[PDB]
């Protein structure tokens, strides 16, 4: 039950070359992929080749994976193909600015994870699936969709000529799958709040340590959160357009709850558009600012994400003042 990409799709990606005026600007954290839709698969190829190397994966296998991943994202307002690449980009930028801090296997795994991290998203949250006993909620009682997103990733790997990790040893093959499983489960915001508070307490008391494996998972978790909300780190007008995509997805989920007769949460209620500014202002103070605050403390090169998130909070404060 997986959509296989066509032969022309992946062939055309192999022959794609990134224009030189973009080479410079893909390295910048604030980079917006939005205006280059046709170039997204090739932008993921480029980022892989720059981070891990031109001989990292077999180009033929890699272009099948990417284009099959694209075909298994749905046409929903926010959690879609665009989002996957935007998240992969933010990781690339982070990884590029802290390169030798991570392994080849970790660099390999996290970009692959970011591209697959919302595979086959239906536009619905964990709470919606659990409340109306959806089959996927019966299968995965906690972090529902995220487990499915890992399970979808593993299925693409298992397709014919798609397994980019084939050439790793069976030991490294199961290492990088645990990196991918862990990184994709971390994208559930329900986990972020636990993760961040720990890292701050670890940081402030001086006990945070990167050769400590338990801590690598927590730092990778925060990076995966940092990337998943990177729409709040782009230039003001871009961040405002991505916000509309998000609410459109929340409001469709609202409509489904109103059909069954249940008042949704304000964030998912299209009649409470007035409060949205107070909703963003809250999200930045309670989630986003604290996220990049702790990320920049661990990885000082990731500061531009904190700066852009603050600059957008200012804009959200000006919105409320009229
Ligand atoms: O839920 C998300 C959200 C989830 C996942 C990725 C996101 C990326 C960017 C912005 C948002 C999100 C975002 O803005 N909101 C919440 C915004 C919001 N609108 N109304 C209320 S209330 N809130 C809110 C949610 C959490 C904390 C504070 C406010
Ligand atoms: Mg998700
Ligand atoms: Zn996501």
Curated annotation (Swiss-Prot):
Disulfide feature: none
Stated consequence of mutating residue 118 to A: Loss of activity and of zinc binding
The keyword Metal-binding belongs to this UniProt entry's keyword annotation: yes
GO cellular component: cytosol; glutamatergic synapse
One GO-annotated biological process of the protein: regulation of cAMP/PKA signal transduction
Record-annotated active site: 79
Binding site for 3',5'-cyclic AMP: 79, 280
Tissue: Abundant in the putamen and caudate nucleus regions of brain and testis, moderately expressed in the thyroid gland, pituitary gland, thalamus and cerebellum.
Claim: Phosphoprotein is one of the keywords in the record: yes
Domain PDEase: 6-322
Binding site for a divalent metal cation 2: 118
TM annotation in the entry: none
Superkingdom to which the source organism belongs: Eukaryota
Complex and partners: Homodimer.
Domain topic, free-text comment: The tandem GAF domains bind cAMP, and regulate enzyme activity. The binding of cAMP stimulates enzyme activity. Composed of a C-terminal catalytic domain containing two divalent metal sites and an N-terminal regulatory domain which contains one cyclic nucleotide-binding region.
Identification of the protein by name: cAMP and cAMP-inhibited cGMP 3',5'-cyclic phosphodiesterase 10A
Organism (species): Homo sapiens (Human)
Lineage: Eukaryota, Metazoa, Chordata, Craniata, Vertebrata
Covered residues, full protein: 715 to 1034 of 1055
